[PDB]
Design a protein around this motif. Structure first.
Motif, mmCIF file in Angstrom:
data_model
loop_
_atom_site.group_PDB
_atom_site.id
_atom_site.type_symbol
_atom_site.label_atom_id
_atom_site.label_comp_id
_atom_site.label_asym_id
_atom_site.label_seq_id
_atom_site.Cartn_x
_atom_site.Cartn_y
_atom_site.Cartn_z
ATOM 1 N N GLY A 1 -2.841 -1.212 7.448
ATOM 2 C CA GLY A 1 -1.488 -0.687 7.418
ATOM 3 C C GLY A 1 -1.448 0.821 7.561
ATOM 4 N N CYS A 2 -2.394 1.515 6.921
ATOM 5 C CA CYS A 2 -2.490 2.964 7.058
ATOM 6 C C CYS A 2 -2.909 3.384 8.456
ATOM 7 C CB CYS A 2 -3.484 3.530 6.047
ATOM 8 S SG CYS A 2 -2.930 3.463 4.343
ATOM 9 N N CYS B 1 1.252 3.496 3.282
ATOM 10 C CA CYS B 1 1.779 2.923 4.514
ATOM 11 C C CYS B 1 2.917 1.935 4.325
ATOM 12 C CB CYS B 1 0.657 2.227 5.282
ATOM 13 S SG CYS B 1 -0.064 0.840 4.392
ATOM 14 N N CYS C 1 0.852 -1.181 0.000
ATOM 15 C CA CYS C 1 0.000 0.000 0.000
ATOM 16 C C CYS C 1 0.889 1.233 0.000
ATOM 17 C CB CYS C 1 -0.939 0.025 1.204
ATOM 18 S SG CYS C 1 -1.952 1.523 1.270
ATOM 19 N N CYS D 1 -7.444 0.815 5.243
ATOM 20 C CA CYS D 1 -6.219 0.038 5.199
ATOM 21 C C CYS D 1 -5.687 -0.114 6.611
ATOM 22 C CB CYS D 1 -5.177 0.698 4.309
ATOM 23 S SG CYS D 1 -3.647 -0.254 4.201
#
Ligand SMILES: [Zn+2]
Ligand SMILES: [Zn+2]
Ligand SMILES: [Zn+2]
Ligand SMILES: [Zn+2]
Lengths: 49, 49, 24, 616, 383
Positions: free
Chosen positions: E377-378, E356, E353, E375
């Motif tokens: 990860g974000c 991130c 992504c 997300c």
């Protein structure tokens, strides 16, 4: 030879469409599989008089 | 032989063909009734044309 | 033959008219 | 064996455990199992590459059975013979068997393929001016023909005309099989014919497949093609005559079949009536053209009785004319004693055996390979039923329980009187009466078959129905026929053994079998072919009906199991019926009272010089 | 120069003529995602008024879709109404059929999914017949979208499987009226590209020819529905930038049944309107006392995610050094998936992504991009 007409006043069309559908289900019943063909006759009682 | 006439078909005949409505105005309320008029028209050469 | 064609046509029309009047 | 130890469970297989054949990894796409014991082929129709497998096996093998999921085929000598005649070599066939089968092809199977396929086409039978010659491409085969020397005075010798079948069976039991293939393209001694199919005639794909099995390589091959009744085997005969375009003789069982076949030539192909001829009792005049066509009966030729001088001259003409094609319709009667000789008396290059019932009670049905040739085409009955070519019949078996007094008298009776007793039980009377009453209300034309004259007359007088047995007048057999065809008041005809063979009958969708001529496996399919021509086939939801009314705890199940063994080999399913919904509430009852049943019982028991000329 | 039988056998057994199998499918996957690599936040129609125009004709009796066209379209319309109310609850839906030459409005425009589903199953029983007329259906849609407010987008969907329309008047005047009324039209034909439908989609949707779609098979029809549930991006010249007054009702709780203001029926539950203290049955519905769009936080919640479309996860190159052995959101071990020793490493299933730098597997990608809309990860990034 002869010409005969049928005039509907937009109020009797339901009658002949009901006639058409009952004729359709009548020919479906006449061409239907009989009950002893579609069902097992073993468990029921034996044939007689 | 029988032909089935609905009122919507009669109105479509009147709108699409002004000659039939023109005959209807001076034929039906004066001399002979509407089914007689339609059978005369269906037996006539104007229907064929 | 001609007169029977004419009379059967006109009386078929008259019977259709009578049936239409009787139904209404 | 491929170094595979027998298992504890493998002992119940009589040397048939083929687990030593190692599974291929890519076996999912391979639809075949090959048995090394007998060459039986197991084919799965649901797997990928199914249509390639099925047409490959029908080119190389005889289908033992064709059910819905798994199809059974037999690798035989004659299938390989036909395959290599139409142009299939050995190693190509072996390679595609190896490719299309999961288990590897064993050494015994390859040995059988190579042994059967090689040494084929060596001896060839040709006709040169009504004189049979066996021709061999290699000289030493004549020297090997040293045991049954029937020689009568490139490498060829003349054969006696009546010993040709003996020569064929001798060549079949040796590894050099006899070949005949009419090359009408290279035949110029016999004049060609202008016979061709009319442009208004349409041909069905299975008929084309049968003709391609017959007319494979480029030569007319003699053999047997079987098709259902109503599938148009007559059309295949017309088309074969149009393809060969040589002089054609047609042998039929009945004179009505003779006139029907003449009508088929006059209607479907462009054959003039001056090129068509009839040999019967009433008709013996023939075509005056150099090559034409004649339709005749089997006992025109094979009768040894004292005949007319006209028939003598006719059969002399038939013997003296070299024929390029013969259409032997209803070939299952050819292995009879007189009817075997018609392929030897009439010297014809190509012999096509058209029938619908290729089965006999005796073993002489296997001799038609020597009489006609190898089996060419088998029509799949279920495939033609599902695509709207033959009717969807519902085979049924109505169990009639034997009544107490009738069985009590039945256990001490002699065999012919045993049939006379168990055909006339009242339970079959009630079952037939109810079936007629019910299917008549369905708008179904019904033909009720009963071979015994007394049986059909008793049922017809019981129910007030028409009956046609052997000694009925022919004009009555036409008037009652047209009344059954057209007059909707009559929908039930009781019919004898006369109706089993080829007589013209109207279309029916229901059949009832009261009595039967033992387990005669030809008769049932002849009876079924009458219903298989039903005109309501194209209507969706249509189902034709077949009934085999049998008496319970009597010889009827033995006979009828022999009767239906053929039909279940073809694949039709006989649903057993032990109860009818309507006995308890039937309006009219036949032999309901014990006194009426007892009266029927004793009825069956009691069943079994110019002036002195005025002087006398 | 012979007959068809006297040539040769078909040779069907010889017709069949006979690790890099990974790449043969995964390059097709790259080609499929190549069309989806472009993404940007489009301003879309959030408050929607859809008119589903249904063909009810003899062309709907055609035996190309199972079992007929009519049953498949009516059940897919049931599915479409259900999923659309599950994705756009604040919208107002009207259903109309085209039967026997007259456009028959089978249900009024409403925010109730259940009434529309009942109308669809009622029309399911009847037999489709008559010659369809487009112009009647577009005029009915013009009539029913007249009380639609300026903020609410006027949208019409047509499933027109027929090829000809027999109109009582000029259909181009109706097209001009619909363009003048800012009614955006998407047409889903079933047989071919009808030119009047192409012109309708082009003119009503500002020169865009991509709104006339024709299916290819059974699954592509459901594809047409489930990208038809999406809000259409509005054009830049459209200025309906308004404020909409609506309130947040509270779920009343009472063991005594009380008359709701919408139905006059006894309902134990309800939602008291913050403007006038009136209870209703369902949400989101307008308050039938003071005309207030009664909602929940969940209804606008269902519509936040369109305004924040996730950027597509970019699969990492196989050559570059992978960040981790397992995935981030489900920690499935990334398959080594080596083709051969000489075939080397291909199609590394890690989807990075860009906001991130977190890798995800294929199942994580095809879960985060339509079912989730965040997300993880974000979000693990401590900003
Ligand atoms: Zn309410
Ligand atoms: Zn309120
Ligand atoms: Zn994952
Ligand atoms: Zn991210």
């Amino acid at each position: 030879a002869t010409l005969h007409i049928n005039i509907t006043t937009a109020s009797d069309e339901v009658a002949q469409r009901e006639l058409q559908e009952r004729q359709a289900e009548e020919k479906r019943k006449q061409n239907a599989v009989p009950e002893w063909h579609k069902q097992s006759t073993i468990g029921k009682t034996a044939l007689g008089r | 032989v029988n032909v089935n006439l609905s009122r919507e078909k009669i109105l479509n005949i009147f709108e699409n063909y002004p000659i039939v409505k023109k005959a209807y105005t001076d034929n039906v309320p004066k001399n002979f009734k509407e089914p007689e008029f339609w059978a005369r028209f269906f037996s006539s050469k104007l229907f064929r044309k | 033959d001609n007169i029977k064609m004419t009379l059967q046509q006109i009386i078929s029309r008259y019977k259709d008219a009578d049936i239409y009047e009787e139904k209404r | 064996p491929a170094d595979f130890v027998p298992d504890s469970v493998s002992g119940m297989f009589r040397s048939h455990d083929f687990s030593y054949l190692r599974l291929r990894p890519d076996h999912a796409s391979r639809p075949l199992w090959i048995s090394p014991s007998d060459g039986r082929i197991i084919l799965e129709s649901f797997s990928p590459l199914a249509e390639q497998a099925q047409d490959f096996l029908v080119t190389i093998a005889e289908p033992i059975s064709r059910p819905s999921h798994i199809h059974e085929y037999k690798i035989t000598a004659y299938s390989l013979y036909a395959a290599v005649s139409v142009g299939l070599e050995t190693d190509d066939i072996i390679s595609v068997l190896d490719r299309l089968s999961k288990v590897p092809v064993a050494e015994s199977i390859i040995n059988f393929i190579k042994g059967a396929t090689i040494s084929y086409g060596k001896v060839k039978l040709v006709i040169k001016h009504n004189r049979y010659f066996v021709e061999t491409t290699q000289a030493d085969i004549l020297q090997m023909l040293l045991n049954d020397s029937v020689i009568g005075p490139v490498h060829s010798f003349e054969i006696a005309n009546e010993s040709v079948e003996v020569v064929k069976k001798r060549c079949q039991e040796i590894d050099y099989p006899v070949l005949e293939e009419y090359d009408f393209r290279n035949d110029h001694r016999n004049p060609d014919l202008d016979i061709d199919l009319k442009p208004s005639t349409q041909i069905r794909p299975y008929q084309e497949k049968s003709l391609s099995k017959m007319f494979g390589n480029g030569r007319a091959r003699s053999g047997i093609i079987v098709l259902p009744c109503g599938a148009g085997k007559t059309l295949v005969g017309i088309t074969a005559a149009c393809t060969i375009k040589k002089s054609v003789i047609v042998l039929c069982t009945s004179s009505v079949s003779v006139m029907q076949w003449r009508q088929q030539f006059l209607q479907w192909c462009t054959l003039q009536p001056e090129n068509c001829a009839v040999f019967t009792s009433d008709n013996k005049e023939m075509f005056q053209t150099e090559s034409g066509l004649v339709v005749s009966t089997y006992s025109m030729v094979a009768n040894t009785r004292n005949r007319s001088h006209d028939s003598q001259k006719v059969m002399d003409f038939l013997t003296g004319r070299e024929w390029g094609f013969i259409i032997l319709d209803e070939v299952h009667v050819v292995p009879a004693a007189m009817f075997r000789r018609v392929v030897s008396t009439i010297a014809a290059h190509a012999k096509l055996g058209l029938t619908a019932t290729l089965v006999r009670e005796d073993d002489k049905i296997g001799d038609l390979n020597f009489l006609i040739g190898p089996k060419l085409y088998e029509a799949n009955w279920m495939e033609l039923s599902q695509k709207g070519h033959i009717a969807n019949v519902q085979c049924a078996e109505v169990w009639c329980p034997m009544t107490a007094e009738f069985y009590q008298e039945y256990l001490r009776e002699t065999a012919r009187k045993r049939m006379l007793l168990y055909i006339m039980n009242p339970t079959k009377f009630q079952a037939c009466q109810f079936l007629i009453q019910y299917h008549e209300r369905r708008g179904d034309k019904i033909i009720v078959f009963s071979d015994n004259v007394y049986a059909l007359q008793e049922y017809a007088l019981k129910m007030g129905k028409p009956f046609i047995y052997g000694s009925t007048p022919q004009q009555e057999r036409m008037n009652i026929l047209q009344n059954f065809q057209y007059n909707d008041q009559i929908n039930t005809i009781f019919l004898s053994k006369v109706g089993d063979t080829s007589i013209d009958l109207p279309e029916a969708t229901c059949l009832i079998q009261i009595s039967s001529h033992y387990g005669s496996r030809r008769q049932e399919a002849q009876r079924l072919g009458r219903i298989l021509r039903a005109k309501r086939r194209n209507d969706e939801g249509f189902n034709a009906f077949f009934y085999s009314l049998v008496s319970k705890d009597t010889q009827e199940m033995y006979y009828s199991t022999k009767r239906q063994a053929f039909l279940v080999d073809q694949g039709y399913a006989f649903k057993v019926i032990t109860h009818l919904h309507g006995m308890e509430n039937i309006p009219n009852l036949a032999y309901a009272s014990p006194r009426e049943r007892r009266e029927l019982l004793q009825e069956v028991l009691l069943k079994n010089h110019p002036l002195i000329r005025k002087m006398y | 120069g012979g007959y068809a039988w006297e040539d040769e056998i078909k040779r069907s057994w010889d017709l069949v003529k006979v690790m890099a199998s990974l790449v043969a499918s995964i390059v097709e996957a790259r080609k499929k995602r190549t069309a989806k690599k472009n993404i940007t936040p489009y301003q879309r129609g959030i408050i929607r008024s859809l008119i589903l125009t249904l063909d009810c004709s003899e062309a709907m009796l055609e035996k190309d879709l199972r079992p007929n066209r009519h049953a498949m379209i009516i059940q897919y319309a049931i599915d479409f109404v259900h999923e659309f109310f599950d994705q756009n609850p604040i919208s107002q839906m009207g259903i109309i059929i085209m039967r026997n030459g007259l456009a028959q409005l089978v249900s009024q425009v409403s925010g109730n999914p259940q009434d529309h589903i009942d109308a669809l199953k009622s029309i399911r029983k009847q037999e489709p017949k008559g010659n369809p007329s487009l112009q009647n259906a577009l005029e009915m849609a013009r009539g029913l979208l007249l009380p639609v407010p300026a903020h609410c987008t006027r949208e019409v969907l047509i499933v027109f499987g027929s090829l000809s329309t027999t109109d009582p008047g000029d259909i181009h005047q109706t097209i001009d009226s619909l363009v003048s009324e800012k009614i955006r039209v998407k047409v889903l034909g079933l047989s071919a590209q009808v030119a009047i439908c192409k012109e309708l989609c082009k003119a009503t949707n500002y020169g865009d020819e991509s709104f006339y779609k024709i299916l290819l098979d059974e699954t592509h029809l459901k594809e047409l529905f489930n990208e038809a549930v999406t809000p259409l991006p509005v054009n830049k010249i459209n200025k309906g930038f308004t404020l909409v007054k609506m309130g947040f009702p509270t779920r009343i709780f009472e063991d005594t049944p009380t008359f709701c203001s919408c139905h006059s029926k006894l309902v134990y539950g309800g939602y008291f309107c913050p403007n006038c203290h009136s209870k209703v049955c369902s949400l989101p519905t307008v308050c039938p006392c003071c005309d207030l769009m009664l909602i929940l936080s969940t209804h606008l919640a269902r519509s936040y995610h369109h305004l924040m479309p996730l950027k597509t996860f970019a699969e990492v190159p196989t050559t570059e050094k992978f960040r981790s052995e397992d995935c981030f959101s489900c920690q499935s071990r990334f398959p080594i998936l080596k083709n051969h020793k000489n075939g080397k490493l291909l199609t590394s299933s890690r989807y990075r992504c860009e906001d991130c730098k977190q890798e995800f597997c294929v199942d994580c990608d095809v879960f985060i991009h339509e079912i989730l809309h965040n997300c993880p990860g974000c979000e693990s990034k401590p900003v």
